[PDB]
Design a protein around this ligand. Structure first.
Ligand code: HEM
Ligand code: Q24
Length: 289
C-alpha cells in the first residue's frame, strides 16, 4: 500500500506560510480555551493521534489520508476531546479549501509547537484525502495504564526507537489531562514548549494515587501529575538514561523532538525524488506579525 505525496496544485512555500499564519493568528486570538491554556496543546495531540494510527506492517492508518474527518475515527474513544481541535481548524480549512485534511491536521501541530516556542519542525506537503473505507479501526492508539515494556512494544509499530519515544513523550510538558476525556486528571496549564516534563519526572516526589475515575496516576505534593506510561520512562533503565539526557540538555531535546515529530507526521508517505524540500515556517514573532 503506497501513498505518494502530491503537492496541492500550484502551491509553494508562500501558500503554506499563509496557512501557518492563519493558524498562528487564531491561536493567539482564541486564548481562553481550556482555562486559558489555548488551543496549542490540543492541536499537538490532534497531529499525534491522526499520525499514530499508522501500522508499518501494511501502511494502513497514518496522516496521509486525512481520515479523522470520518465518523469512525472522529468517534474513537482515544480521540475524545480532539473535536475541539477539529473545530478550531474548521475556519482555516474554509479559508484555504485547497489544503488537504492530512496536511492541515499535521500543519496544525507544527504551527502549535513553533508558536509555543518549541523547536522548528520541518514540514512537507502533499498528503491526499482518501475515502471513508480507508479509515483505520479504533484501538490503534496507546493505553496510558501500562508499563515501559508496553510503551516500547507499542511504538515499534510506528517504527520508533527508545530515543524517539522518550523525545516524543516530552510533548507531555504541554496542556493537561481531563477526567471526562481520558479518565486521568491534571491541574497544569502549560502552553510553552520546554523540557520540563523530564525535569519534573526526575525532581518531583511522586506518589501513586487513585483519581476520581478510580484510575492510578502519579502525583506530587506540588500538584504535578504523570500517567503510568509517563512514569515508566523512569522505571526502565534505558528510558531513564534518555530522560536524564533531555533534562540536562534543552537543545538536544529540541533537535531530537523535531526529528521524531516530523518522522511521526510523515510515516507512511512516499515523497517522490523531485518533491519540494521540507518547509521551515517562520513564526509570527519572526515575521513581526
Ligand atoms: C504512550 C504514549 C502516550 C499516551 C498513553 C498518551 C496519553 C495521553 C492522555 C491520556 C492524554 C489526556 C487526554 C485528555 O484527557 O484530554 C494526553 C494528552 C496529550 N498528549 Fe499524549 N500520550 C502519549 C503520547 C503522546 C505523544 C507522542 C504526543 C505528541 C508528540 C502527545 C501529546 C499530547 C498532548 C500535547 C496532550 C495534551 C492535550 C491537551 O491539553 O488537551 N502524547 N495524552
Ligand atoms: N503537565 C502535564 N503532565 C503530564 N504528565 C501530561 C500527560 C499527558 C498530557 C498532558 C500532560 N500535562
Amino acid at each position: 500500500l503506497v501513498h505518494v505525496a502530491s503537492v496541492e496544485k500550484g502551491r509553494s512555500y508562500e501558500d503554506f506560510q499563509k496557512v501557518y499564519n492563519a493558524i498562528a493568528l487564531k491561536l493567539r486570538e482564541d486564548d481562553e480555551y481550556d482555562n486559558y491554556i489555548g488551543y496549542g496543546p490540543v492541536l499537538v495531540r490532534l497531529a499525534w493521534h491522526i499520525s499514530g494510527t499508522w501500522d508499518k506492517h501494511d501502511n494502513t492508518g497514518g496522516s496521509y489520508g486525512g481520515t479523522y474527518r470520518f465518523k469512525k475515527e472522529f468517534n474513537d474513544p482515544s480521540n475524545a476531546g480532539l473535536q475541539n481541535g477539529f473545530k478550531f481548524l474548521e475556519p482555516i480549512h474554509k479559508e484555504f479549501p485547497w489544503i488537504s485534511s492530512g496536511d492541515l491536521f499535521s500543519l496544525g501541530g507544527v504551527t502549535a509547537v513553533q508558536e509555543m516556542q518549541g523547536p522548528k519542525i520541518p514540514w512537507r506537503c502533499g498528503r491526499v484525502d482518501t475515502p471513508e473505507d480507508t479509515t483505520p479501526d479504533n484501538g490503534r492508539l496507546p493505553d496510558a495504564d501500562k508499563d515501559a515494556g508496553y510503551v516500547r512494544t507499542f511504538f515499534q509499530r510506528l517504527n520508533m526507537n527508545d530515543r524517539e519515544v522518550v523525545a516524543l513523550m516530552g510533548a507531555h510538558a504541554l496542556g493537561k489531562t481531563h477526567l471526562k476525556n481520558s479518565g486521568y486528571e491534571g491541574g497544569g496549564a502549560n502552553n510553552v514548549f520546554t523540557n520540563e516534563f523530564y525535569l519534573n519526572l526526575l525532581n518531583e516526589d511522586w506518589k501513586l494515587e487513585k483519581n476520581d475515575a478510580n484510575n492510578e496516576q502519579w502525583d506530587s505534593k506540588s500538584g504535578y501529575m504523570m500517567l503510568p506510561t509517563d512514569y515508566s520512562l523512569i522505571q526502565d533503565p534505558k528510558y531513564l538514561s534518555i530522560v536524564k539526557e533531555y533534562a540536562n540538555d534543552q537543545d538536544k531535546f529540541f533537535k531530537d523532538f523535531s526529528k521524531a515529530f516530523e518522522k511521526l507526521l510523515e510515516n507512511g508517505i512516499t515523497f517522490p525524488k523531485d518533491a519540494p524540500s521540507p518547509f521551515i515556517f517562520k513564526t509570527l514573532e519572526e515575521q513581526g506579525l
